């Protein structure tokens, strides 16, 4: 509505 | 309605 | 809406 | 109604 | 309405 | 109206 | 130490 | 140390 | 120390 | 040792 | 030591 | 050492 706040950390290390 | 804060975090740390 | 703040922070390292 | 003095104040200080 | 005084305020201080 | 002052302030202080 | 987060927030509404 | 993140808000709306 | 990230939101409405 | 094999991840997925 | 194979991951996805 | 296999990585995705 008034605020639509969308954070999306996706953090693969993987590997290693 | 007023606020949809939507906040993800995936940590897919994985391998190692 | 008014805001419609959307941060994708995709951070796949992998490799290494 | 003579004086119809109307005050309003929305202080939506949501996020964070 | 003789006075139709109308003060309105909408301080939408949302993100950060 | 003899006297209709209307005072509208919107302030969106949003992003950051 | 590792993070310091500080959030404040003051809401002198006041006058009205 | 690593992150210092602060965020202040002060909304002295008064008047009115 | 790494990220100093310091966000400042004086918001005097005042008057009307 | 003969094969001093070290893994360190550190996810310091901290703020939001 | 004959090998010494290191791997180091800092992932500091802070701030948001 | 025969085989120093040093392997750093730092990603600091900061800020937003």
Do not use: E, N, Q, T
């Given at each position: ?7 999306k ?8």
């Open positions: 509505g008034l605020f639509d706040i969308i954070k950390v996706a953090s693969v290390i993987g590997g290693l």
